[PDB]
């Protein structure tokens, strides 16, 4: 009263995992996510600027993704300030597509509970998810600590909705997120950043297909926070 920031005084800001799924198996019938490569390239340079050690894995299967995050939580994070994961794929509420079929997000993040990844205790664990969480469209108008503590989920959309994307400019959430980080990534606290992000995708974007049933639609991101302190990317 006051109270404040997460300790950022470490050799490393932290590791960042970017899973970019563009092509899926015929079995699933899901379409190619053209423009996601443009999203991933943008995310790559931004999180690098912040100070993350970015790594991009392409078209992963459910096992790959599961195993990929499992090992991450097994690495030693003592010299890291935080951890970040960016998921780029098709998805359905509570789920993200892999090249295979489908995987519950809960299991991806689960590996970081405070009792399953001790080098990350009392440290922020960030997950940015760019995926659908349903198919609806927004049509328009006018001491001891909780193993579940210190997580942050920045979903590109609200539960049950579709997540928009430009084949040329990339997905809406990503495009907007990278713009705010580029201008304030090292100036505002996470919630301020993710808030300005919500404002852009909400005001500065509006769909536009020839088919009428998807015209002039809108989208609003969903930020889910279990963070216990303010987070800045600049000691």
């Amino acid at each position: 009263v006051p109270t404040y920031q997460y300790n950022m005084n470490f050799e490393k800001l932290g590791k960042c995992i970017i899973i970019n799924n563009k092509n899926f198996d015929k079995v699933t019938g899901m379409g190619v996510r053209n423009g996601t490569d443009k999203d991933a390239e943008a995310l790559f340079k931004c999180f690098r600027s912040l100070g993350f050690d970015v790594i991009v894995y392409n078209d992963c299967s459910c096992a790959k993704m599961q195993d990929l995050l499992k090992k991450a939580s097994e690495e030693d994070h003592t010299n890291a300030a935080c951890f970040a994961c960016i998921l780029l794929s098709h998805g359905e509420e509570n789920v993200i597509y892999g090249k295979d079929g489908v995987t519950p997000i809960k299991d991806l993040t689960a590996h970081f509970r405070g009792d399953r990844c001790k080098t990350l205790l009392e440290k922020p664990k960030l997950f940015f998810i760019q995926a659908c969480r349903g198919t609806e469209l927004d049509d328009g108008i006018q001491y001891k600590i909780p193993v579940e503590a210190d997580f942050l989920f920045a979903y590109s959309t609200v539960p049950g909705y579709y997540s928009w994307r430009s084949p040329g400019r990339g997905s809406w959430f990503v495009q907007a997120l990278c713009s705010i980080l580029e201008e304030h990534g090292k100036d505002l606290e996470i919630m301020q950043i993710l808030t300005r992000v919500n404002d852009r995708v909400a005001r500065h974007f509006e769909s536009q297909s020839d088919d009428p049933h998807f015209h002039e639609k809108k989208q609003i991101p969903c930020v889910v926070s279990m963070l216990t302190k303010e987070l800045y990317f600049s000691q």
Partner: peptide, 17 residues
């Protein structure tokens, strides 16, 4: 079954703008 759903469930719908 509606084609307008085919695209969405297969995530083919895009912003074309």
């Amino acid at each position: 079954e509606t084609h307008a759903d085919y695209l969405l469930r297969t995530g083919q719908v895009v912003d074309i703008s």
